[PDB]
């Protein structure tokens, strides 16, 4: 019950069910605090998660997914989509 894939280009994904980094663990919130631009490092594209705003000490990060909203935020759409 978790969508542990990703997309680099439309042909291939980055799975994160069994393998992966610690980068998978951050969840959805419709208000963003992180995005992930796709950069290329030496012919193959890693996926790198920057920040948008000044995140504080132990301030829980967000991420938009852009394909309910259990964040508890009001200023959001009530679903994922």
């Amino acid at each position: 019950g978790s969508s542990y894939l990703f997309r680099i280009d439309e042909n291939t994904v980055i799975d994160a069910t069994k393998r992966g980094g610690i980068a998978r663990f951050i969840n959805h919130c419709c208000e963003p605090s992180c995005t992930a631009k796709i950069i290329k490092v030496d012919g193959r594209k890693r996926i790198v998660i920057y920040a948008l705003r000044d995140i504080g000490t132990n301030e829980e990060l967000t991420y938009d997914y852009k394909f309910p909203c259990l964040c508890g935020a009001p200023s959001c759409k009530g679903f994922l989509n």
Partner: protein, 107 residues
């Protein structure tokens, strides 16, 4: 590691041959010690490594491979220590740090 090319004896990539020449026919003091160009070539390695780490770091954000001078001002002015070191300087054809004073931003 090696015997020739003193940099390789020290483990640097900057020449200790050229730096020991440029401490004598630059006329800085009478008699430069033998350890002195080694220490100086290591520091000039490290500050060049500290810039070109941060330069290509913000080359990746731009998404370009090679480093243009615009990436160097973004590596220098974004970093406080480097900024202090390069306080007076102007990097040619290098833009500015993108900021607006936030009074001027709209309501």
């Amino acid at each position: 590691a090696k015997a020739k090319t003193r940099s390789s004896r020290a483990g640097l990539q900057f020449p200790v041959g050229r730096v020991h020449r440029l401490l004598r026919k630059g006329n800085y003091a009478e008699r430069v010690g033998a350890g002195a160009p080694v220490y100086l070539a290591a520091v000039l390695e490290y500050l060049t490594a500290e810039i070109l780490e941060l330069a290509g770091n913000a080359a990746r954000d731009n998404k370009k491979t090679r480093i243009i001078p615009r990436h160097l001002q973004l590596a220098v002015r974004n970093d406080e220590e480097l900024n202090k070191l390069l306080g007076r300087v102007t990097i040619a054809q290098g833009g500015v740090l993108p900021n607006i004073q936030s009074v001027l931003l709209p309501k």
